[PDB]
Design a protein around this nucleic acid. Structure first.
Lengths: 92, 78, 99, 107, 105, 91, 99, 82
DNA sequence: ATCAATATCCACCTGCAGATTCTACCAAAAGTGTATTTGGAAACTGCTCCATCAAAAGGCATGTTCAGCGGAATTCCGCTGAACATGCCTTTTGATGGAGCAGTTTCCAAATACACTTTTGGTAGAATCTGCAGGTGGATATTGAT
DNA sequence: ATCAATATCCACCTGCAGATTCTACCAAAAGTGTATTTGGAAACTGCTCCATCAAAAGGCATGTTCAGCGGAATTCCGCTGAACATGCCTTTTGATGGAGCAGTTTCCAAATACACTTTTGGTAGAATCTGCAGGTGGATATTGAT
């Protein structure tokens, strides 16, 4: 059974280097990631259907992130993702 | 434009809702709500418009947004 | 001759009237304007299918008519008959639309 | 042979995500962009909530973040609060909040 | 002969099946699912039209219009629960005035 | 495409002398498409929970039980189970 | 002569107390039974992972706590401080649980 | 035999819940009304939870069963497998 | 109870907007047929964790008494909705150029599908590590009686 | 306001469960590298239907007046909340047989993947048909004034 734990723990260390996390909380965190994960892929999924497109791209992903997340969160979310895409693209 | 939504009109809605006596300060309280509703819904419809590379919000664009809002509407797709 | 109707006789009459019809109760032109105005703040120079505006209104009025239903209930719960803002306020809060 | 995560400048697992996208059957195909973008969004979000939780832990003089901290962080931020307005964080409790009219005296 | 008939149905079993796979719901789609589902779409349909046709009659009307569908739905506990978050354009509302609001007889 | 014709057919078995307005048919179409999406989605999820690759009538049934109110559900199950039976017994 | 706290002085302390913790407020065993009773009078011969019984409890109190807040507001709306069934009922009606 | 377990939710217990809910004063009738409300909640979730269980042809209601049934009813629980 | 003014129905009437019947065209469906593949049931079974009996100790639920206070009933009165006839300014209706929303074609960047090789993140299980829970005492409020 | 009774605060204290930390096997992931396929952007276009506009339509803004609604104020009353005694049922800690979830190999009924073929449902342009919406009228129920 996979889990986003080690990655949560990494991100955790970056923001608050000396703070730990109980297992119960890491579970709540794993639940959080999977929750949002499905939610976005869902909006992405339908969006694609509504347009008779068979592939989910960074463009659907992005629209979903906009439909899904509130003001400030969405704004910043797009950046990070665009950022990553750009860096992933310009690297090969 | 917001005041374009008139007292008589608002009064009518309220009566369809079974409201018998209406306070004066309700008309402005009403408009505000109606505004947040449209904002919340149009915002999502327009997003559908743009994702589709269009310049015209379509009835389906609104249908889709409303569903996401949990305000499923029958009669324009559904 | 001096003839008048008592407060409410006209109301209840209006209630029965509108609860029977299904027509939209807001004037379309003013509505459509407010719609576009709101829209323009999200994306410039847009167009609307005659039908998109119709859905929006149909959805709008519907939402309201129902919110007035919960408000009258809130007004009544407080042993009143005049719906006030705090009644709308309370309904939207329990609806999860506020806090 | 770097990983796509590193190649994207990420901490979350780009490959894993692109993988789940397939097994979740959301569309016939999934372009290489989606997973990169989605892992980023996922990562960004966990950071935002961990930042906020981490402070709550600190505020309550604790070192290890526990569910309550997660809860305090979410209910205190307008946005994470909306993003999760229908999520129940177990063992989180509620935010201390007493209605005015319930307090004593007069002034 | 069409699957609809083999299943003795008025609805399009072939179409339903088509929509199921093309809808990305699963990797594969058994042969009966679309039959079953079509069977279930048909029945729910008949149910509404039934109650809806009755409303028409109870109005001295022979053609079913939106109102007749709205009335038929919010009057049936179950259907009403199912469409509990659906707006029927041009449906209006059920006639109802709070007791406490009726004239003081 | 649209379920309209099938709707109209079903309508006639029920109320043979009753007709329907376009706006009503449109609503009926919206109704069919809705339910279709809701039942399908549940089934889809169901399969995933059990790590299954196929959506069978098994799923459609459970889905239905989860989606429709008791009585409504009961009949819907019946109608459905009947079709599969009828269908399976034929060439 | 002996010290005596006025009504509501303890209540506030309890609100402050309980609002400060996160422990489940219902006897664990009695809850497991109720769960098993209900489950059983729906399908016999069923078993429960301890975590399932806990997820239900977590869900259930989370629900009740939130429902009590709505109730509290509804009462306050009526200019009272003592919540009553009618308050719970108004809340559930607006919430869409018995509308 | 299991019976009247709903009375297992004591007056003390219901009171603590209302306290966390910020309620100061409580009507004597609140307790039974509440038991009723709780019962309908538990009924609704268990049913779906158990529908999921039978479908999986299992005899043990799992924590996921409960988490799936809760999401179905829009009461998503983080902490028990999602 | 008695008019007087309206509001409200019921029955009949008809023009036309929108439902309907008729037809030829046909591309996307839907069905039939053949060959190949595979999801997942079946069966043997290791092994997790569930139901359960055991028992002791105290944290708590139960039940009583009693007074304090909150809610309901009532009277009072200032204030604001609402009914109403008045008079035009905004909405509605049917007519018209033209802007995009869709239909068709082209063809390449990008996504399968598949063979191998390499990196790793779950993990059985060891042993060591460490925040904080739960206990204690004393300094600091917060209450309530006077 | 002064003081007595109580609760909240809180920093120190340390056994200890739950968390950090390996050593390592590794089936599964993830990554590398052709070979093959194609989904959908991009450019060009016909044609709806949408933004615009003048004209005939018709609902809203407006000031008066007063009925009546809602809150402030004053009560008896009863039911809720502290406080307290008593003692039961839950919680705690284990051990335990074994039900049944879950892993692995076995394998065919059923689903997939074109291919060839026959039907059918949507689109279109014409013509013909008809449920019912408003309009009229005259009867009567409703409401309000006395």
């Amino acid at each position: 059974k996979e889990s986003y734990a080690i990655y949560v723990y990494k991100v955790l260390k970056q923001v608050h280097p000396d703070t730990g996390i109980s297992s119960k909380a890491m579970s709540i965190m794993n639940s959080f990631v999977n929750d949002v994960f499905e939610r976005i892929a869902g909006e992405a999924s339908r969006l694609a259907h509504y347009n008779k497109r068979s592939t989910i791209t960074s463009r659907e992903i992005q629209t979903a992130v906009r439909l899904l997340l509130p003001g400030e969160l969405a704004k910043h979310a797009v950046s990070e993702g665009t950022k990553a895409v750009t860096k992933y693209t310009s690297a090969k | 434009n917001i005041q374009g939504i008139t007292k008589p009109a608002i009064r009518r809605l309220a009566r369809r809702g079974g409201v018998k006596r209406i306070s004066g300060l309700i008309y402005e309280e009403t408009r505000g709500v109606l505004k947040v509703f449209l904002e919340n819904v149009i915002r999502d419809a327009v997003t559908y418009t743009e994702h589709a590379k269009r310049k015209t919000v379509t009835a389906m664009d609104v249908v889709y947004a409303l569903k996401r809002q949990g305000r499923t509407l029958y009669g324009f797709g559904g | 001759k001096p003839h008048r109707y008592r407060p409410g006789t006209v109301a209840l009459r209006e209630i029965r009237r509108y609860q029977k019809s299904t027509e939209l109760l807001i004037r379309k032109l003013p509505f459509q304007r407010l719609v576009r105005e709101i829209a323009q703040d999200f994306k410039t120079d847009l167009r609307f299918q005659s039908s998109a505006v119709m859905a929006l209104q149909e959805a709008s009025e519907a939402y309201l008519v129902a919110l007035f239903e919960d408000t009258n209930l809130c007004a009544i719960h407080a042993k009143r008959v005049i719906i006030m803002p705090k009644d709308i306020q309370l309904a939207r809060r329990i609806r999860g639309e506020r806090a | 042979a770097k990983t796509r995560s590193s190649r994207a400048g990420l901490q979350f697992p780009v490959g894993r995500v692109h993988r789940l996208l397939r097994k979740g059957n959301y569309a016939e195909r999934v372009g290489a962009g989606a997973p990169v973008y989605l892992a980023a969004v996922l990562e960004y979000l966990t950071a935002e909530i961990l930042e906020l939780a981490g402070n709550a832990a600190r505020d309550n003089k604790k070192t290890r973040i526990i569910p309550r901290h997660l809860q305090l962080a979410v209910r205190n931020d307008e946005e994470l609060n909306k993003l999760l307005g229908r999520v129940t964080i177990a063992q989180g409790g509620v935010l201390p909040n007493i209605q005015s009219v319930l307090l004593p005296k007069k002034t």
